[PDB]
Design a protein around this ligand. Structure first.
Ligand SMILES: C[S@@+](CC[C@H](N)C(=O)[O-])C[C@H]1O[C@@H](n2cnc3c(N)ncnc32)[C@H](O)[C@@H]1O
Ligand SMILES: C[S@@+](CC[C@H](N)C(=O)[O-])C[C@H]1O[C@@H](n2cnc3c(N)ncnc32)[C@H](O)[C@@H]1O
Lengths: 133, 133
């Protein structure tokens, strides 16, 4: 299983120390530049307000299985958290499209470090992404 | 980027012909067996009711950029859908944990074909995975 990057992220977060814990609590604007060879996968995306972005957290550790979430004292499995470190550092964010510039998207709520590779983008859908509780 | 398979899915969905398009609409129970090597990642997962599962749709086409959803006539980009076919066929599911054995989890709302590779697991979080509109 080999992932082929379909784009790259451009944001104001250069290092792990600059990006927000969770993009939903930040007003920072990020850019998703999809590669020309995949650009055609954006057809009619301007009809969407919210999308799901999967990116690769390249500087994250891939052999860490236990972590202490911020504010916590004891460790827990990474699969029970949103920590960047995990066997497959896939960053998952629900973002809001603010603009569509050809093969580039201006969005907010994305918390990827500048330069992070983009893996996939899907339609955000309340009925399947949200749990009524 | 290369993905490490952290587990395998066991489900009653053999092929795309008997699999729910969206697992949230099915009541079928699926099992996620994580390889011992990553077992530590499940530490304290029994304390959760909902988690997000990322799996690899290994029999899906990776060279389609457009598709026509079931209840649709016009085609749109795969990045505006939840369709299997896309550059990186990663299935995304919010699931409900019914049971936790040792390295195995029985959940519902998963729509992975039987034997599909598991890629990642994250805690489900309303405030970030769901948009309040
Ligand atoms: C908690 S993660 C977001 C995880 C996402 N909500 C998810 O569910 O997968 C955001 C943090 O990961 C770090 N991060 C973002 N992009 C990264 C990258 N390309 N490599 C390493 N770390 C990254 C940032 O420092 C940021 O504070
Ligand atoms: C629409 S996809 C699920 C997408 C997921 N809910 C998401 O948000 O990314 C589910 C469909 O893809 C197909 N599918 C599931 N697992 C697969 C696999 N391992 N290989 C190929 N196709 C698969 C099944 O036929 C099923 O009806």
């Amino acid at each position: 299983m080999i992932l082929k990057p379909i784009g790259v992220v451009k944001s104001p977060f250069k290092t792990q120390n600059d990006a927000p814990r969770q993009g939903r609590f930040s007003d920072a604007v990020s850019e998703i530049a999809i590669f020309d060879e995949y650009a055609d996968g954006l057809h009619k995306i301007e009809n969407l307000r919210h999308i799901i972005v999967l990116y690769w957290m390249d500087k994250a550790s891939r052999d860490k299985l236990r972590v202490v979430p911020p504010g916590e004292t004891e460790e827990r499995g990474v699969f029970t958290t949103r920590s960047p470190s995990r066997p497959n550092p896939i960053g998952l964010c629900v973002v809001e499209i603010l603009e569509v510039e050809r093969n580039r998207l201006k969005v907010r709520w994305l918390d990827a470090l500048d330069g992070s590779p983009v893996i996939d983008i899907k339609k955000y859908s309340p009925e399947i992404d949200c749990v009524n509780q």
